[PDB]
Structures are given as C-alpha cells and as structure tokens.
Amino acid sequence: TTRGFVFTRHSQTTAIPSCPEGTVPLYSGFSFLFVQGNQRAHGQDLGTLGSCLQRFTTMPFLFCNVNDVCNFASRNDYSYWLSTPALMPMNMAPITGRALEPYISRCTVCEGPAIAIAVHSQTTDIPPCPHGWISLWKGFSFIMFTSAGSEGTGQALASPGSCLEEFRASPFLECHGRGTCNYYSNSYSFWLASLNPERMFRKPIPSTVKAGELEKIISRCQVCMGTGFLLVLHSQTDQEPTCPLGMPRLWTGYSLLYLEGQEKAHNQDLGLAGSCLPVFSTLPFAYCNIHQVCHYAQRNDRSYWLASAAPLPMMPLSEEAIRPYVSRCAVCEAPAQAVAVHSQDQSIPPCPQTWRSLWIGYSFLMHTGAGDQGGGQALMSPGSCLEDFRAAPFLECQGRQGTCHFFANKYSFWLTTVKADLQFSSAPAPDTLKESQAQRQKISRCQVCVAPGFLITRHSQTTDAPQCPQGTLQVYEGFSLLYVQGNKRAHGQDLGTAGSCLRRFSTMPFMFCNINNVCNFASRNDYSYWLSTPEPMPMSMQPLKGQSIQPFISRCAVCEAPAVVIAVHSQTIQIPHCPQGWDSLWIGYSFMMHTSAGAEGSGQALASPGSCLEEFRSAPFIECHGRGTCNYYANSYSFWLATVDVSDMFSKPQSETLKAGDLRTRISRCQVCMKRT
Amino acid sequence: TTRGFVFTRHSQTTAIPSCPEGTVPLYSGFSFLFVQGNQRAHGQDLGTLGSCLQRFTTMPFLFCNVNDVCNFASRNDYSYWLSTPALMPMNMAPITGRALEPYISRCTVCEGPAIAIAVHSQTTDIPPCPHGWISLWKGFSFIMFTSAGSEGTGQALASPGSCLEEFRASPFLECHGRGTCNYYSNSYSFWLASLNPERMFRKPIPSTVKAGELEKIISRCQVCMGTGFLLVLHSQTDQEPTCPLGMPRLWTGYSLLYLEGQEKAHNQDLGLAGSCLPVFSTLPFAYCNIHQVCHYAQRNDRSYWLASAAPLPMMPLSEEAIRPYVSRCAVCEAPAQAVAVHSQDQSIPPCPQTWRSLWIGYSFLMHTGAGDQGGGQALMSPGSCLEDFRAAPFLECQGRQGTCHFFANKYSFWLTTVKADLQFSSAPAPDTLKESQAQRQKISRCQVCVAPGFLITRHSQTTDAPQCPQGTLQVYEGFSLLYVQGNKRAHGQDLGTAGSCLRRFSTMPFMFCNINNVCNFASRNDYSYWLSTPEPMPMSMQPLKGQSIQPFISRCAVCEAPAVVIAVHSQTIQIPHCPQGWDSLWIGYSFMMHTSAGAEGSGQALASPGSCLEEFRSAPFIECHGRGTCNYYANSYSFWLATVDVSDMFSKPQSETLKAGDLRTRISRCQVCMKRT
Ligand SMILES: [Cl-]
Ligand SMILES: [Cl-]
Ligand SMILES: [Cl-]
Ligand SMILES: [Cl-]
Ligand SMILES: [Cl-]
Ligand SMILES: [Cl-]
Ligand SMILES: [Cl-]
Ligand SMILES: [Cl-]
Ligand SMILES: [Cl-]
Ligand SMILES: [Cl-]
Ligand SMILES: [Cl-]
Ligand SMILES: [Cl-]
C-alpha cells in the first residue's frame, strides 16, 4: 500500500513510538529539533525524517572554512532535542554522558500510502479530520521555540510536526558542543492559542496560566491521512477564493505570512496549508517557559498577514477596521502536486504539455518586516506565484494593541526579468521604478501547474550541467542558486527543489518594493549566493566581474521523477542503505547549512536531496553582489552533519581541528533514494 | 570646588539618593537603563546623566520616517528601568499606572571637582581606590543585561555605572509601549565574576548558586574620585606598556575588547580604562536570572581580547598556551585628556602646537567576531590609534572550553586614506591588498595628543560648516559621519565627538582585513551614513553618485572649549535650564537613535551634545554604499526622546500617529551647556 509518503512520529518519552495503523516503520531514532551554529539557528521540521536521527550527540555537526579547515565541537555552538518528562537534578546541574538518555525523546519514521497533514481547531476542542480523511493521532498545536540568544525555529502548521501528542511547557533541551544539556530560563515554547472566533478583529484578552491549567489556552490538533495533495490559494482580497473545478474545498481562512515571538520570525510558506488559518487574530499564539507558566498577550509579539488591495491607511487600523485589509485563502484537495514555473521574463512561462494550468502571476520571492526579520517563498511552491503584483503585499499586526498597519520599513522582494543574451557580460543595470505598470514590466512572471510526477534538482558543482539520475528525465538546466540576502535578511532555496536552479544567471536576480509604491533594482547593497566550482580565485584575489564570473558558478538540472525522492543520512563514514522498496539515485555528503555576510544564511532539509551534496567542499558557494561582483570571503562557512560512532553517542564531543586530507573522516554520508513503483 | 565633572548615583530603591560628600546635586529622577526600538537596543551609561530621567514613562521615545510621519507608542517597542526590591503580584500580573512608582529606582545627578571612576577587584573583596583617590561608594561589578529578543546593553567598566551599590539577580524591569512593566524569565543580568588570579590561563570551574549565596561568585568594586584623567595604553604584545613620563601608573592588565553573553556583544572602548582588566579569564563574567539563581561557566558565552603578534595558531590555544597571545595594558594618571587625531592620509597628522604628543599609529575603526556581533572605537578616543597595524588584531576565547583562537570569520576595519582632490568626483576605487606594507600605505594614520581643553562637535545639517558656539574656537571643519556598517554590523560615532566630523568625505571611508592577512577596500557590500541636508531627492528617486552627492551631506565643526560641555533634556516642549553655574551654547531636539539597512543602527548619549540636534528632521541622515551611491530608504528611521507631561507619567502611553506640522509637539527639547570658569 505504501507509496513513498514518509513522516515522523515523536513519543516525547523514552519509548520508541509505534507507527499509526496503515503505515509501516522505516527506522527509529532520537527527536532532533535544531542546531545553532555561528549564532544561526537551523531546524528540521518535526514531521519529516530529518527530525529523527539514529545517533544522539550534543554536537551533531561541524563547520568548515575557505582555508579548507574544519572545526568540530571547538567553538560555542548548540544542538536542541525534544525531551521526556524526566525530572532534572535539584541543584540545577546540567546532564552529561549516558545519563542524558532518559531525557531525550524517541521517534519513528513511517511510510504511508498517502500524505499526512495536521489540522488545528484554534480552540481547546479537538478538530475533526477533513471529510474522508483518517485520523493518525491527536495533540496540541506547536508552532515554534527559542532558546539561547532568542534563536530558534518552527514547524509548518500543516505538518504533523506542528501536532505534539503531549503538551509540555518545556518540550526541549538545550545542548552544547561542550557536552552538557539543560533547561534554561529563556527556553520558550510557542503554541497556537485557543481563540474566540467571534473576537477575530478585537483586542486580545491577556492571560497568564500556571501548572494545572496551562492547557486551557492551547489549541488542539489532529494528524490525518487522505488521498491527494493540498493546493493553497490566496485571494489577496477580502473575499474567499474558489477552488479549481474538480478539487474539493477543505477549508478557508486568512492568509498568514509569519509570526514573530521574542523578535524571531517563523514563516509559513504561502503554498502550504499552514499559511491558511481559519481564525484570524492579531495575536494567534501564546508562549510558555520552563517554570510551567504560559503567557498570552503579555509582552510585545506580533503577526504578519497577506493584505488586500484596500487603500493604504494613514494610521493603524483598530479592531473591526482591520477586516477589509486581510487576504483570504482556501485549501483544496488536488489529484497531484501543483508547482510554480517562473520565466525571469516578461513572457508568461507555459506549463509543460499535459500539465494542467491553474493560474498565472508574478514571482514573489521574500519580505522583511520589523527589525531584521522576514522570510520568503520557495520558487517551486505556488506561494511564490501571486496573481496580483503588490509593492505592499502584506501587513503587520501589533499583537496586544489589536491593530494592524503598513509601516514604512516593510519591503517586498520580487524575482526580476533577466535579458537572456546579456548574462554575465554586464553588471545589473540599476533602476528605480515609480509607476505600477513600469514595475510589472520588470518582474518575472509565473504560472502554477499540476505536475503528474515529482521534481528534483541535482547540482554538478562544476561549469557543466549534471545528468539527471537514473530513471528520471531532464526538464531544464540552470545555475545553482543557494540563497539571496535582501535588506540584510537571508532567504534560501532548498537545493533539492527547482527554486535552487535558475535558468538565467544574474548577480542581482530580484528587486525590492516599498509602501510608497517605489521599487528599486540593484540600487542598494544586496546579495545573491551560488554553489561554486573548483575554479581557483585569481592571484589578485579581487572580486570577479562580468564574463570572469562564469567559471565559478555551479550548474544544475531539474529532473522529473515517477515517484517520491528522499535523502537519508548515516551519521557515519558508511553510505546509508536506502529503505526497503526504494532505489538509489546518488550518494554524497550531509550538507546542513551555511552563513556568509553578517553571519546570515540558510540551510537544507535532511529529508531533501538538497542535503546530499555529491562532492564535499569546505567552500561550496560564492558570494555575489548587486553591483555585479562575486568573490569568496573569509567568513563564508559551510556546516555538515558529523559522523557519530557508537562511542560518540552521549559522551563528550572530542573537539578537533581538521585539515584538508582528514576532513571527510568526520562528515556524515547520505544517499538519495526514489520509491520503487 | 565643582568644575563640571558630572555623574549619576542610583539608589535602587524608592529613596532619592544623596550625592557623595564633596559633590553637589544638580537634579534627581528615575533610573533609566535602555530602550529597544525596531528590535534595536540603545542604552544610557548608568554613570552618566542620560541614565537619570526626571519623568518616568513606559514609552519615553517615538520614531519618525522618511514620509515625515512619526509614531508614538503604536508599534511593539520597549523601555527598561532599574528596579527596587518591591515584590511583584503573586499571580505574576504586570504592573501599570501609578502602581509602578514603588518599583522604579531613583537617581541623583551630581557635580564634582574631578572625575569619578570605578575600580573592580574581580574577587569577593572590595578593591582599594588608587593611591590618593577618595572613595565615593562601594558595590558590585555590573556589566550588561539582556531581555526581550536577547537585546540589551552594558556599562563601561571604569564608569561609576558599572558599580551598583546593591546586588540584584533581577535589577531591572521590562516595560512596553502598551503601558505594562514586568520581570520575565529571560531577563538576565551579567556581572564580573570573582576569579582566582592563579588560574587566569586555565579552564573555568563551573558553578550554579541560589538565593542566599549569589554574592559568593560576584566581583566587588569602589567608585573613587581623584584629580586628573585616565590614559589607557595597549601594548599589542605580551609585555606591559610603560606610562608616559610624568604620569603615574595606576594598574596594568589584559586588553579586553568585548564580552558576549547570550550572543550579544558588550564592548569596552580601548581608550577607556574599562578595557584594561587586571585578571584575565576566558570567561570573566557570570549571569543571573529573576529566579534568584546565578550561573558561571554553564552555557556558551565568550570573550574577546586584543592580541599580541605571536604567530597565528593552527588550532585553538589551550590554557597556558594562551598567555603569549593576549595583549597587555596600562592605565596611567594624566594631567589632561588625551585624544586621537586622524589624517585620512599616509602622512602622520601633527598634534596642534602646545599639545603634547604621546604616540603615533594606525586608525582602528571597528571589528566583527562570531555571528553578527562586534563593536568599534571612537575616533576621538586613543583606542582608535593602535601603534602597530594588524590584519588580525584580536582573538576570541571560547569561555568554558578554556581556549582562545583566531577563527576565519574575524574582521578588523581600519579608516583609509582619502585623496583630498578626488572627493565626490569619483566612486571609491576597489582594491585587494595582500602585502602588509601595501596595506599600511592605504590606512589612515593617527597621533594621540594631550589637549589642554575639551573638544565638542557641532553639525549644521546643511552644506555650510556651522560656527562654533560662543566662547569656543574652531579647530577644523568636516563632514557629518553618523555611523558605518561593515559585514552588516553597525558602529556609530557620538555626534558630540570629533569622530563624527571627518575632514575628507568618501562613501567608503574604511576597509576590512582578515586573518589571512588580506585586506579588501570597497569590495563587498558595506555602508557609510551621514547626517543630511534639506536637499530634496531627484524626481527619479535614483541613488546619487559622484558630485551629485555633495548637496546632501551635512557639514560639521570641531570646537575647542575651555571647560566641560554637556547636554540636558527637558522631556517637555520647554527648553531645559542649564544647571546653575553653566552657560548656554545651543538649544535643540532630543535625538536618541536611528536604524537603516537590516535595522542595524546606533545612537547618542543623552549626556553628549550629540543628542541635541538643532533642527528636528524626521529623516536626518542619508545612506551611502561602497559602490559609490547614496540615497534615502524607506526603512531609514530616527528615534527621539518624547515629551512627558505630569499627566503622561506612569499612565498608559497615548498612542498616536503624527503628521508633518504636528511632529515637534511630542519631541523633547534640549540645551547644550558649558561649565562657567
Ligand atoms: Cl562547539
Ligand atoms: Cl537561565
Ligand atoms: Cl504579546
Ligand atoms: Cl513608519
Ligand atoms: Cl543591490
Ligand atoms: Cl575576506
Ligand atoms: Cl510601542
Ligand atoms: Cl517569561
Ligand atoms: Cl558559559
Ligand atoms: Cl574558521
Ligand atoms: Cl563595499
Ligand atoms: Cl526604499
């Protein structure tokens, strides 16, 4: 019955969890939440296999530099794991060694015949599964978390990872490269709140709860399995959108862009059903601390939503005045996966023949709100294809104040057109565009299409386009885009997805727009980052410009596969076996995250082929700028999953500095696998 | 007896503190710690008059945008105040309204005949004052603090503000524009630790203490008054420097650059005695939480120190191996204040005649270490003039690990030479310099001189240089530098100091250097920011380049004054009176901080003339880039101290959005005053 749809279940105890009825176990492990390296957090969604590591260690990664030197457990980095209810020592000492085992949650990776999703009631009642869908488990609506330095990450709200079966004010441990784990007083968990749906557009009522009553303010959820895929539509108006003909509507709601707790953004991809919340609030979440206290509407947190085209307000909108400004959404049951295609051109890109066209739009890439926070869309996701271009596509809600507003620091970023024959030859030509039609003519266009198969991306890490893996068919060739950085905020593209493969290269493939309806292209200090090749730097070590950039940029192919493709990781020097019933596509090294300018960066999902780079490189990417230059920089860092022998589990990490020939002895291996059908 | 040397004393109770014997009170108020606006913290040193505000409110500032609109208490910003021992409600409810009064510490601003400094024992014993100096009070060694989003700030370690008379695990309250204040579980205080001086170069011993024993790990201090000024020397070698002839040596130590707690840097200016710590440690501090628990060496914090010229290590230096790599320092008693003069030229700038020359060096501007953290030097401070140029002038110590190392992401930033006759005409010419002599020839030179008077800076906010205020003499004219941003990290120059007045303009007045001994100028994506003029943007709204930049840049004058100059702020629409015995220099508006790209920014000290801008402007500064462009941007924000009527004190801030004609009705006024002699 199984067809390659893989999810994780977490016990939150020392017990290894059983797979739900109708699904089969692939392997079990320890519940891995996120890493924090060079002050940057990078997580693995709890519903995906990347959150289940077979080998526990307080330091599951290492980092490498442009001098071809790697450092393991030798600086001041962190890892975080879901915990059990085991009580900590009374003297508040940390735990080390094998004594850690009773404290770490266990997990099991399961394969099912169809996708598993989470649905949330946003009340204290358990929501029903969508009609026809089968219940896998019930739980509590878990969103995000922060710990050291207020760094953290979150769950996609339609992922099973957003539905924890046991409520915990303190669901996770902070661990150090030093070998210790503990709970700390700034370790915070964030949950969807139980809301009054009649008060959507009214000021939140503050509440503080203590042990014995914490669950009275927490939303409930179910994880459900049903055939088909989820298609998400955002109207960008105050009217609910209608589903494509033949696709049943599962629910409607309000277009959630991101939530911000303790000044840390947690975004929902607009193409995923977690971006469609049935119950709006200026503050749809609460947070809890390790002292078994939860606070709702007691500090300074906020929310961000896609906006309608109602006229810009001159001052914050209060309570009921908010309603006409929030975009609506629908979640529809589709027979296959929808993807966005982008042209980097004024012309609308056609859907491949036999692929059903759903809508056409403009290429929406990323956004920044208050502070240095923001987020962005996956270019392979329909959430990157908005039917209506808007310089100001989103609003901010001031949480407790019960208002929303468009403040002047809001930026939207859009993929731009690129002249096909001028690639490399010239620097981006800066421009400032003040009229909406002028702007629309410089923005990349897109079309959302239903694909009969699955798309994966492969990167050659050379100047030659790679071949697709056995049994797949090349769709197009391109250039390996790793991430972009706009207004200092980094936003990545999953290297296993088509957004990491742009058909046209530019050092500045996007522009930004403000609430004054003025857009600026290549006119500030922004970046693009690309996987790179073995090409050595010039002896002068000056940045490359123009045609001299070409030999440095990795190429890629997007490949059409007949079945689902995943990556698995051994955490050893051995190649991990593909799960039974899956066939090998390629092998590689476990690539997890990266940072460069301002220590901003992004990372890979371990479940994705993008986490399995076929050639290890201490310096796998090059940094480009809107002014038309590219170079390597001394603070460009790569992060890799580490090997963990049985003797490395639980014990103090053996800190080490490794030079060139001895690097890959500590790098985990991986295999990219495709379900056999 | 008084001669214009002004400091603050804090009671940490509801009692208004008396001034120490031999000093006279100027006014009293409430103990103000820092603001957090647009996710950026900006503090007022607790030893300075900026930490004593007469009118308490939970929202003492507002912010303004490039559309000439200001917003007061309408977003999600914070203020922080020193607290009393008053107990909070049992249900953990926040406090609002007049009920806040018993919780806010009081302060008194005092004038004395000479400077007041803090000295720290780094033990549980009280240190003696330097020989001949008079004790003002005793206390506990307070460094820094973090709260929401792990934002916070710190005290200069030779400031009286680093010596709190009562130890408190929870010394401060977090307040909101909403009108609430409370303690939160992530509100952390950081203190110098009690250290074993025999274990300076050994691994820290971890400790966790609870109520009743917290002070057993906390350093003690005294605040002392003595005639003369402090001169700080850094050898950049493992040998202690010798004081200039005629200047008694007060102490020697190790060159502290910055400390990092919860991933937040707190820097010590290298020209201030807080950068010279007698007792080295890889972790010289501990932290406490509001649950009356303090932790030493239990997490992942670190320290940074100036380095010697010993050869670069291939792996971290462990314990005793550290010693030859840490720079030494001396603190000397000087008869007048020493300042740095910079040439922006290969030629050494001469000391003004009659000013005593102390040393010559290279212009050291800023630095970045792990993550997005770092700091920098005031160009008027001798700490910006290092005798030996070093691409890698500082090292990082990994705290608990008991190691130090030079990792590849470390950057040093140096002020560069500027061709006098090429200003404005051409964009900066990018260059990559790989040889030390080549680098030294592109770096600005400096000389440290003893000045017989005091220097202040005035900004015209027009294209004309301003006149110096009455009774002062112009030293030079220049361009108004507000701050720089390198590797995304912002670093400001106090607008009341000569570092905010550069004789030569460039959009890129600095370069950066890495541990591979390679320096890069105008070759990445860095910024400079300048006070601006009334010049309107071009209709195209494209960035300015070349000679078109000139009409946008504010000019300044540096002025020599016969006596100390301060600013005072009314928090009302009325001009504050100068203190008795002080004469008026100019009046203005209370300018506190600013942010632009990435919401990075800097701010002003309320004690400084730099916090008193003579013309209010919603958009007082323009953003320039290393590529040679300048423009205004929609996220360029200014922050101003707000007016607080008696009816605004304690009560809920009356949130308001203000347009152009009604802006200054909510802007505090100020006066710049000079001691009459
Ligand atoms: Cl580490
Ligand atoms: Cl803690
Ligand atoms: Cl809140
Ligand atoms: Cl604004
Ligand atoms: Cl740019
Ligand atoms: Cl570099
Ligand atoms: Cl506010
Ligand atoms: Cl809390
Ligand atoms: Cl620590
Ligand atoms: Cl490194
Ligand atoms: Cl630059
Ligand atoms: Cl802008």
Numbering used by the authors:
A (entry chain A), B (entry chain A): 2 to 678
Direct quotes from the study:
The collagen IVα345 scaffold, composed of the α3, α4, and α5 chains, is a major constituent of the GBM. The crystal structure of the hexamer revealed a ring of 12 chloride ions that, together with up to six sulfilimine bonds, stabilizes the hexamer structure. The α345 hexamer harbors a number of structural features associated with pathology, which are located within the LCL sites where pathogenic mechanisms of AS and GP converge, and potentially DN.
The single-chain α345 NC1 trimer produced recombinantly in stably transfected HEK293 cells was purified to homogeneity and crystallized in the presence of sodium chloride. The crystal structure was solved at the 1.76 Å resolution with a single polypeptide chain per asymmetric unit. It has the designed orientation of α chains in the order of α3-to-α4-to-α5. The atomic structure is homologous to the crystal structure of the α121 NC1 domain, which is also homologous to all reported crystal structures of tissue extracted from the human and bovine α121 NC1 domain. Based on sulfilimine cross-linking analysis of the GBM α345 hexamer, the expected chain pairs were α3–α5 and α4–α4 (7), although in the crystal structure, we observed α3–α3 and α4–α5 pairs. Thus, the present crystal structure of the α345 hexamer demonstrates a labile nature of a trimer–trimer orientation in the hexamer before sulfilimine cross-linking. Despite rotational mismatch of the crystallized hexamer, we discovered a set of twelve Cl- ions at the trimer–trimer interface having the same geometry as in the α121 hexamer. Geometry and residue specificity of Cl- coordination are identical between α345 and α121, with only one exception, that is, two-thirds of group 1 ions (four ions per hexamer) are not coordinated by the salt bridge to the arginine residue of the opposite trimer, rather identical arginine within the same trimer coordinates respective ions (Cl- ions #1–2). The central inner cavity going from one trimer to another through the hexamer interface accommodates multiple structured PEG molecules but would accommodate much larger molecules if present during protein folding or the hexamer assembly.
